[PDB]
Amino acid sequence: SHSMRYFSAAVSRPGRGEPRFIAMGYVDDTQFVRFDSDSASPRMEPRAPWVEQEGPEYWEEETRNTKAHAQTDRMNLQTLRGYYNQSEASSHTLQWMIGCDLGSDGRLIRGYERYAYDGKDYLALNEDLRSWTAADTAAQISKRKCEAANVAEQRRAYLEGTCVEWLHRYLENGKEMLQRADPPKTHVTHHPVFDYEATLRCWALGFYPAEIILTWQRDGEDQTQDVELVETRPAGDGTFQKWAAVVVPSGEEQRYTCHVQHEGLPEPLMLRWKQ
């Protein structure tokens, strides 16, 4: 399963200059392009090696369109400020996300496009890619505006055509980095307390993509309720990590089994602490 996404964030800062605009494109969990208005010379820049082969026409076109997005979004910031009758001295955040998901057969399974204002859902394109859902009475103005312009038609065209096509291209060009399935390196750690109890921590390291399932078994039973699970985190080298801990009665460690499920895995593995 694969997907391509583009995100953007426009952040006003009255008194500290023009609103900052950042835009970025991801293939799955890998960022491959980035634009930042705070750069000395704003432009769409590569963030992955496999996109660096695109010629100057590509970068020239991406940078030009993205600079246009920035201008449209700075204007949006300020239409919304009007809609909510907010102070000209206040700071606000407008976020955007658009993307296409490809099934395991390689054809479109779903596309989107949504907006959030000050951390709240604002406007979203519906699954049918032909209608919109407004989160409040301000967003309804935007919704009516989009409907009157029949813009959904153009967004759908991108999601069904360009998005899928280029995702397929990036997947091929960065095949070694993108269509790879590292399996996580796993092990369980033992942390005693004196005679009564010990913490068993199940580790999953160096895996990609970030999607993974960790679960603890005691004679073949999930413990979800008393298991502390940390948010999956980036190692910093392109892989992810995650651990699941469970406090068990001393002397019964062997009754617990960790269940790890990752795509790079050929079969879900089961770990058990080594004495």
Partner: peptide, 9 residues
């Protein structure tokens, strides 16, 4: 490939 235009809200 980013979509050409951003939406006007």
């Amino acid at each position: 490939r980013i979509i050409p235009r951003h939406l006007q809200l």
